[PDB]
Design a protein around this nucleic acid. Structure first.
Length: 42
DNA sequence: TGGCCTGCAACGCGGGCATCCCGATGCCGCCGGAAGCGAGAAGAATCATAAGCCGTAG
């Protein structure tokens, strides 16, 4: 929301690897889990 | 200390009255020249959009 741009991209690895970016075709990795540290930055 | 203002008597000519000629003027017919209103075009300006640095944090 702070900077919305369809061209702005740095990694793009997550969306490229989970789906094709639209998603009903490729539904690979139906189960995802996000492990994160217990600090405030986590 | 020097010059402006004014009373006064003598010289001077202009105001007042009469009048015919002249030039402006109102009127009428006729010709012309900005105008101004709307409309189209150009330049000037203030609001709205994308960071950059400051210093820690990942």
């Amino acid at each position: 929301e702070k900077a919305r741009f369809d061209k702005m991209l740095s990694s793009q690895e997550v969306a490229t690897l989970i789906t094709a970016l639209y998603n009903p075709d490729k539904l690979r990795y139906h189960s995802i889990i996000i492990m994160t540290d217990a600090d405030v930055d986590g």
